[PDB]
Design a protein around this motif. Structure first.
Motif, short mmCIF file in Angstrom:
data_model
loop_
_atom_site.label_atom_id
_atom_site.label_comp_id
_atom_site.label_asym_id
_atom_site.label_seq_id
_atom_site.Cartn_x
_atom_site.Cartn_y
_atom_site.Cartn_z
N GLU A 147 4.30 -7.02 -2.57
CA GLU A 147 4.02 -6.44 -3.67
C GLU A 147 3.33 -5.28 -3.87
O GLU A 147 4.03 -4.13 -4.97
CB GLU A 147 2.49 -7.51 -4.79
CG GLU A 147 2.62 -8.96 -4.42
CD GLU A 147 3.44 -8.39 -6.07
OE1 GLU A 147 3.24 -7.36 -6.78
OE2 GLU A 147 4.23 -9.80 -6.57
N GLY A 191 3.23 2.98 -17.77
CA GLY A 191 3.26 1.48 -17.28
C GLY A 191 1.81 1.45 -16.29
O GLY A 191 1.18 2.46 -15.90
N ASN A 192 1.45 0.46 -16.35
CA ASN A 192 0.38 0.07 -16.06
C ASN A 192 0.60 -1.74 -15.28
O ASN A 192 0.78 -2.74 -16.61
CB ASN A 192 -0.68 -0.32 -16.45
CG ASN A 192 -1.21 -0.46 -17.77
OD1 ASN A 192 -1.27 -2.15 -18.00
ND2 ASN A 192 -0.65 0.35 -18.66
N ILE A 193 0.62 -1.73 -13.90
CA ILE A 193 0.69 -3.17 -13.62
C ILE A 193 -0.10 -3.67 -13.00
O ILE A 193 -1.46 -2.93 -12.15
CB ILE A 193 1.41 -2.90 -12.54
CG1 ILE A 193 2.57 -2.96 -12.91
CG2 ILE A 193 1.12 -4.31 -11.13
CD1 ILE A 193 3.44 -2.02 -11.69
N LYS A 194 -1.40 -5.11 -13.90
CA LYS A 194 -2.78 -5.71 -12.69
C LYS A 194 -2.40 -6.95 -12.75
O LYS A 194 -1.59 -8.05 -13.15
CB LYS A 194 -3.62 -5.91 -15.17
CG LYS A 194 -3.35 -4.97 -15.99
CD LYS A 194 -3.91 -5.09 -17.00
CE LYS A 194 -2.67 -5.77 -18.34
NZ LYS A 194 -0.78 -5.07 -17.85
N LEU A 195 -3.20 -6.71 -11.25
CA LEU A 195 -3.10 -8.20 -10.45
C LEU A 195 -4.77 -8.66 -11.33
O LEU A 195 -5.55 -8.00 -10.61
CB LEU A 195 -2.90 -7.83 -9.57
CG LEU A 195 -1.58 -6.69 -8.46
CD1 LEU A 195 -2.00 -6.78 -7.35
CD2 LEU A 195 -0.76 -8.15 -8.86
N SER A 196 -4.29 -10.11 -11.34
CA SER A 196 -5.49 -11.16 -10.95
C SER A 196 -6.63 -11.18 -9.58
O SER A 196 -5.12 -11.89 -8.61
CB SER A 196 -5.75 -11.97 -11.54
OG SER A 196 -5.65 -11.58 -13.47
N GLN A 197 -7.29 -11.20 -9.07
CA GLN A 197 -8.30 -11.47 -7.57
C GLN A 197 -7.76 -12.68 -7.64
O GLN A 197 -7.88 -13.80 -9.11
CB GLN A 197 -9.00 -11.31 -7.75
CG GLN A 197 -10.33 -12.30 -6.66
CD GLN A 197 -11.01 -11.69 -6.24
OE1 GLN A 197 -11.23 -10.62 -4.92
NE2 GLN A 197 -12.70 -13.20 -6.35
N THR A 198 -6.74 -13.35 -6.67
CA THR A 198 -6.57 -14.93 -6.63
C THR A 198 -7.83 -16.21 -5.64
O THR A 198 -8.53 -15.45 -4.58
CB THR A 198 -5.10 -14.61 -5.74
OG1 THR A 198 -4.02 -15.93 -6.69
CG2 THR A 198 -5.08 -15.41 -4.40
N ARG A 220 6.98 -2.91 -3.92
CA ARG A 220 6.82 -2.85 -5.17
C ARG A 220 6.20 -2.49 -6.43
O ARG A 220 6.83 -1.42 -6.75
CB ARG A 220 7.62 -4.44 -5.50
CG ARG A 220 8.01 -4.74 -6.71
CD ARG A 220 9.19 -4.29 -7.42
NE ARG A 220 10.10 -4.55 -9.16
CZ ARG A 220 10.73 -5.59 -9.47
NH1 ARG A 220 10.63 -6.59 -8.00
NH2 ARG A 220 11.20 -5.72 -10.12
N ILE A 221 5.17 -3.36 -6.30
CA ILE A 221 4.10 -1.96 -7.66
C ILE A 221 4.68 -0.25 -7.66
O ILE A 221 4.55 0.51 -7.95
CB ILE A 221 2.95 -1.54 -7.33
CG1 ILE A 221 2.53 -3.56 -7.81
CG2 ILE A 221 1.96 -1.17 -7.41
CD1 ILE A 221 0.71 -3.74 -7.06
#
Lengths: 10, 247, 249, 248, 9, 13
Positions: free
Chosen positions: C143, C178-185, C146-147
């Protein structure tokens, strides 16, 4: 002239 | 506002791959019936036409007709940042300086938003006249792409000739010549009159970049009219390519 | 004498792949602890730090400390001649002028012996500070690769922005932003003493990510006014840390 | 006329792939016994020899011996237009200035025909000696290709040494040196009448290994003072032999 | 300051 | 001479 798409439009 | 949600966001990834090496810039004409794009290539030898109907989108809103000038190389780059399983939402105000694109990952927990600068285009959309065709060939799109590729290694131009039982593709160059004969038994020909037409392989090989969109392609042909290479998109529209006779 | 036997010879192949395009030559410090490398890239904007502890090798002998000056491109060419399932033995005399690499194919009846010329390299090795960090982000390595790749298509610089519940990566150039936001899982994990909003050069990051094959996870450690650490674990034996000075402008 | 039909047409695709980067143009000698091609590369350091027996074709007709001058890059372009499962038929009228290549697809109702212009080649005839070699090594073609490739990143030359139980390949260059030893297998098979230590240019072997797809096996035959032969079997039809002069 | 030297010890 | 295939062909030199 015929080898251009313009010729066939409208 | 304009806002369109497409659960199969890979349609748009594939569309832009099918556009971006033929044309640099284009107006995306957004209305309540859907999205239309029409543009000649810079040589003026060919034309592409994209139709995506509103009912193909999972949600679709368009309060006012917009004409959005887009650099397709840039839009491609943005769409590269989308995975094949992503839901994609296009969003733009009625007086748009930018296009928002939002990618929602499937496994979830990942959301990307991209904001693409639009451009001013002043283009003159003349009409495509709805014609009648001497021969319409329906075939596998993989097989057409292979033929255009192979023959482009022998010469510049394909002579496409059609009759009741089958269609033939021929080329010739310094090294010699070749013919590929396909019979109707999935090949399908509805022909009212026989045809023998010549076209430039260089443009056809840009057209076949759309092959991922459909496992079939239709070729519509008459003397004195452009060739149409059509790829249906799902249940929602098509990409049509038009190619002047090679003179 | 120095002799190290690594049955999972593939670790070495991946380490060279992770290093050879970022730095041209480096000292491999060999001791009884294991194999340590520490080197700035040419521009001095980044630093790499490799640990391969002796206990990760199936056999390990180091009679005397040794600084082996290595051309990384040459070592990589040698390691391309190893199959992925080869047992790889490294071996050097005291005060070595060359390094022997022997590759044993474990199925096949095939043994390769290479001999690499060493370089004389002027040392200069400064200590890396020991510290703890405002935010530590553990996430999947694929990830992060890719990011970094995608954002580099939009801009030169990544703004990394981190809070208790998620991390955000932002870029901005000529064509837009652009911005990519990942949530804590329940994996993306965030261990935060306080939020951070830091900017870095994607060009360097997309080189760090060539380490991705070493691990399925990567960890990002950050604080205001200090380098980013991107660490890849080399399971049960060490790690590869890349440090990246913040971007200035 | 000349007409030969080959159900397994991929063989001919692989043969052209194996030749075209090394040889620009060659004469295809057609006769009743089959097809034979022989040619030095333009530097005269290597030589290739293709033999396809008439027996290995599904039909075979030759009314008059034919020397057909072919530009192997053109022929390769044409054979690219053949699918790997196609039935391929070659056909040349007796006063040929062209060769017909017909591709019949297995599945689909598709047939392709190509007409290739021939060239006028006045090549020199010359005899390849028949001999018994000091050392013959039978081995996996893939393994030989990996060896030649890997060693060429170390140096320009390979020293090949052979003994009863083992063959060694070594190279040395600016970065240092490398050697790879393969033991006889109890698959590698070594028949050593007398030991050799011989030097050859790796670059040319890397051309020869373009034949790897024709066979899962390769055979290296060597003696002092003579070219190396690197032979790939075209099973049930013939072979492609590459000859390489010693590097001096 | 955008060099690692700045931070070394 | 000896580095060229010509040297070894019939009649061999």
């Amino acid at each position: 002239k015929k080898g251009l798409i313009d010729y066939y439009l409208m | 506002m304009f806002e369109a949600r497409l659960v199969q966001g890979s349609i748009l990834k594939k569309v832009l791959e099918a556009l971006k090496d033929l044309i640099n810039e284009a107006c995306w004409d957004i209305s309540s019936s859907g999205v239309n794009l029409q543009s000649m290539d810079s040589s003026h030898v060919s034309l592409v036409q994209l139709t995506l109907r509103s009912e193909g989108f999972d949600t679709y809103r368009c309060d006012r007709n917009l004409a959005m000038g887009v650099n397709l190389t840039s839009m491609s780059k943005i769409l590269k940042c989308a995975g094949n399983e992503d839901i994609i939402t296009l969003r733009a105000e009625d007086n748009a300086d930018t296009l928002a694109l939002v990618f929602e990952a499937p496994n979830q927990e990942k959301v990307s938003d991209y904001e693409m600068k639009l451009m001013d285009l002043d283009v003159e959309q003349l009409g495509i006249p709805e014609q009648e065709y001497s021969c319409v060939v329906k075939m596998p799109s993989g097989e057409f792409a292979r033929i255009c590729r192979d023959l482009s290694h022998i010469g510049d131009a394909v002579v496409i000739s059609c009759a009741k039982d089958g269609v033939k593709f021929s080329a010739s160059g310094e090294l010699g010549n070749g013919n590929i004969k396909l019979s109707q038994t999935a090949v399908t020909i509805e022909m009212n009159e026989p045809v023998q037409l010549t076209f430039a392989l260089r443009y056809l090989n840009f057209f076949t970049k759309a092959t991922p969109l459909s496992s079939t392609v239709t070729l519509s042909m008459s003397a004195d009219v452009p060739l149409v290479v059509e790829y249906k998109i799902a249940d929602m529209g098509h990409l049509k390519y038009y190619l002047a006779p090679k003179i």
